[PDB]
Enzyme design. Structure first.
Site, PDB file in Angstrom:
ATOM      1  N   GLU A  35      15.262 -42.220   1.092  1.00  0.00           N
ATOM      2  CA  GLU A  35      14.095 -41.576   1.672  1.00  0.00           C
ATOM      3  C   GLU A  35      13.072 -41.187   0.577  1.00  0.00           C
ATOM      4  OE1 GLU A  35      13.016 -41.410   4.540  1.00  0.00           O
ATOM      5  OE2 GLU A  35      14.729 -41.648   5.887  1.00  0.00           O
ATOM      6  N   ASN A  46       2.568 -41.480   7.654  1.00  0.00           N
ATOM      7  CA  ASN A  46       3.036 -42.404   8.708  1.00  0.00           C
ATOM      8  C   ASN A  46       1.806 -42.978   9.427  1.00  0.00           C
ATOM      9  OD1 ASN A  46       5.845 -41.775   8.303  1.00  0.00           O
ATOM     10  ND2 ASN A  46       5.462 -39.786   9.334  1.00  0.00           N
ATOM     11  N   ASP A  48       0.978 -42.934  12.499  1.00  0.00           N
ATOM     12  CA  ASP A  48       0.486 -42.058  13.546  1.00  0.00           C
ATOM     13  C   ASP A  48      -0.283 -40.846  13.030  1.00  0.00           C
ATOM     14  OD1 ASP A  48       2.437 -40.276  12.691  1.00  0.00           O
ATOM     15  OD2 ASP A  48       3.544 -40.331  14.526  1.00  0.00           O
ATOM     16  N   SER A  50       0.949 -38.568  11.024  1.00  0.00           N
ATOM     17  CA  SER A  50       1.849 -37.522  10.551  1.00  0.00           C
ATOM     18  C   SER A  50       2.200 -37.876   9.067  1.00  0.00           C
ATOM     19  CB  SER A  50       3.120 -37.437  11.400  1.00  0.00           C
ATOM     20  OG  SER A  50       3.804 -38.704  11.367  1.00  0.00           O
ATOM     21  N   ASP A  52       5.545 -37.517   6.065  1.00  0.00           N
ATOM     22  CA  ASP A  52       6.950 -37.152   5.751  1.00  0.00           C
ATOM     23  C   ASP A  52       6.942 -36.463   4.361  1.00  0.00           C
ATOM     24  OD1 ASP A  52       7.738 -38.393   8.020  1.00  0.00           O
ATOM     25  OD2 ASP A  52       8.585 -40.142   7.011  1.00  0.00           O
ATOM     26  N   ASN A  59       9.326 -35.133   8.786  1.00  0.00           N
ATOM     27  CA  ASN A  59       8.085 -35.495   9.427  1.00  0.00           C
ATOM     28  C   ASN A  59       7.372 -34.280  10.015  1.00  0.00           C
ATOM     29  OD1 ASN A  59       6.175 -36.877  10.859  1.00  0.00           O
ATOM     30  ND2 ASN A  59       7.477 -38.476  11.722  1.00  0.00           N
ATOM     31  N   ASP A 101      19.782 -32.334  16.507  1.00  0.00           N
ATOM     32  CA  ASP A 101      18.847 -32.628  17.611  1.00  0.00           C
ATOM     33  C   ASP A 101      19.313 -33.560  18.693  1.00  0.00           C
ATOM     34  OD1 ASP A 101      16.178 -31.939  18.518  1.00  0.00           O
ATOM     35  OD2 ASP A 101      15.679 -34.065  18.211  1.00  0.00           O
TER      36      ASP A 101
END
Ligand code: AU
Ligand code: CL
Ligand code: CL
Ligand code: CL
Ligand code: NA
EC number: 3.2.1.17
Length: 129
Positions: A35, A46, A48, A50, A52, A59, A101
């Site tokens: 990562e 990202n 969209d 957003s 990270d 995110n 989650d």
């Protein structure tokens, strides 16, 4: 801070990540490796809009607030910048919520594609833990 492989493993253990939600420590070191290459300051935008953040690329779409991801949530109740600290406590605390989650470590796509099913124990090989 760019952690060393055994150094991060030791810090993740201390913060209770080893075997959290059933994931052995080597899974967590492997996810961090792919990562962020172990760099606590890593950031990646990202498509969209957003972003990270940190050693585990959390995110802003759902987990932290960066003030520039419209309509997103801040489930770990922290500024995303807190996830770039030399001290990984905030990243670990938030990762614990992410992994609980519902989808386990599959929330980390590099973990799914590059760690899942592999010999993750190699990541903690030779470390004094
Ligand atoms: Au720490
Ligand atoms: Cl925002
Ligand atoms: Cl630390
Ligand atoms: Cl699971
Ligand atoms: Na957010």
């Amino acid at each position: 801070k760019v952690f060393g492989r055994c150094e991060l493993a030791a810090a993740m253990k201390r913060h209770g990540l080893d075997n959290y939600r059933g994931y052995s420590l080597g899974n967590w070191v492997c996810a961090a490796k792919f990562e962020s290459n172990f760099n606590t300051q890593a950031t990646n935008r990202n498509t969209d809009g957003s972003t990270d953040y940190g050693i585990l690329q959390i995110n802003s779409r759902w987990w932290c607030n960066d003030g520039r991801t419209p309509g997103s949530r801040n489930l770990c109740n922290i500024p995303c910048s807190a996830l770039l600290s030399s001290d990984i406590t905030a990243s670990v605390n938030c990762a614990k919520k992410i992994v609980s989650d519902g989808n386990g470590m599959n929330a980390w796509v590099a973990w799914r594609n590059r760690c899942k099913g592999t010999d993750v124990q190699a990541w903690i090989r030779g470390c004094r833990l």
